[PDB]
Amino acid sequence: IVGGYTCGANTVPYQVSLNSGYHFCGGSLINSQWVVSAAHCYKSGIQVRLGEDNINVVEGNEQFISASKSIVHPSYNSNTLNNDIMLIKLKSAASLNSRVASISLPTSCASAGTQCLISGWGNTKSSGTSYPDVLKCLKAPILSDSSCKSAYPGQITSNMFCAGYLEGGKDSCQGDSGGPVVCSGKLQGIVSWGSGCAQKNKPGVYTKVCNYVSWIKQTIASN
Ligand SMILES: COC(=O)C1CCN(C(=O)[C@H](Cc2cccc(C(=N)N)c2)NS(=O)(=O)c2ccc3ccccc3c2)CC1
Ligand SMILES: [Ca+2]
């Protein structure tokens, strides 16, 4: 997260860290046994780490659970990043409590202007690479589709929305992918992509979760 702030230990209880000997992506706990992330984060041998703050130190409250199966959206396109959503089933159910909780799926799409909270352990620098130990947060509004499409001509699908600041300096970045975009207590987006990080007129593009509610529910119900 570039231009964000230290969230505070366990203040984002639904935030998940996807680990394979190091943190490579974020995710959101949607129920005791299912995590939603980005399809481009797909990797075998994934360990889901819940209740994390400092990812390098064991401080207590952590829960390391292996993924039993990662279901990448069947229509995910790795070039366009369209349908960039993946469901991960936990080998065991997470122990939900004050520091490890699930986030609700939206019942309707969020409108432009809506302020959301984006979080993750991704790169904190626009020019260079600097990864934080603790979770970083960023509050950012959902942009209008006209502005979004103006920023990324021919790259925005109906399953994507822009959120961030056109002036640059504040945005999600590498390592944040798969992470949550929560608006009014609902998971509206998944950190997907962007041209660089915190660049002027190049906001972050996120997977529009409200377009996937039925798919998520149906897939979970059949798995
Ligand atoms: C297929 O999955 C990948 O290989 C991933 C590589 C990383 N990736 C990116 O968008 C990167 C870094 C990144 C990641 C997440 C959010 C932002 C942001 N600015 N909000 C930037 N930004 S980038 O400018 O280097 C970039 C942008 C668009 C891309 C589209 C397809 C493939 C790689 C891409 C890389 C997403 C796709
Ligand atoms: Ca830790």
The closest ligand to the CA of 178 turns out to be: 1
Ligand 1 site residues, Cβ closer than 6 angstroms: 40, 78, 81, 171-174, 176-177, 191, 193-197, 204
How many helices (H) and strands (E) in the chain?
Answer: 2, 13
| Contacts by 211-218, CB closer than 8 A, 24 or more apart | 211/109, 211/158, 211/159, 212/73, 212/85, 212/159, 213/105, 213/106, 213/107, 215/73, 216/30, 216/36, 216/85, 216/87, 216/105, 217/105
Write the CB contacts of 74 (distance below 8 Å, at least 6 apart in sequence): none
Q: Are the CB atoms for 216 and 30 separated by under 8 Å?
A: yes
Domain boundary assignment for the chain: 1-12+103-210, 13-102+211-223
d(CA 124, CA 145): 26
Q: Is there a common fold for 1-12+103-210 and 13-102+211-223?
A: yes
Q: Is 40 a catalytic residue?
A: yes
d(CA 86, CA 216): 9
d(CA 205, CA 162): 5
Query: Among 3.30.930.10, 3.30.470.20, 2.60.120.10, 2.40.10.10, what is the CATH number of 13-102+211-223?
Result: 2.40.10.10
The reply, when asked if residue 167 is annotated as ligand binding, is no
Identity at 126, one-letter amino acid code: S
Q: Is 84 a catalytic residue?
A: yes
Q: How far is the CA of 60 from the centre of ligand 2 (A)?
A: 7
Exp. method:
X-ray
Which residues are paired to 62 by β-bridges? none
Report the CATH fold assignment for 1-12+103-210. Thrombin, subunit H (2.40.10)
- Tell the burial category of 89 from Cβ atoms under 10 Å away from its Cβ (0-12, 13-18, 19+): middle
| Contacts by 64-72, CB closer than 8 A, 24 or more apart | 64/19, 65/90, 65/91, 65/92, 65/94, 66/90, 66/91, 67/35, 67/91, 69/223, 70/42, 70/43, 70/44, 70/46, 71/219, 71/223, 72/39, 72/42
| Residue 154: half-sphere exposure toward Cβ, Cα within 13 Å | 1
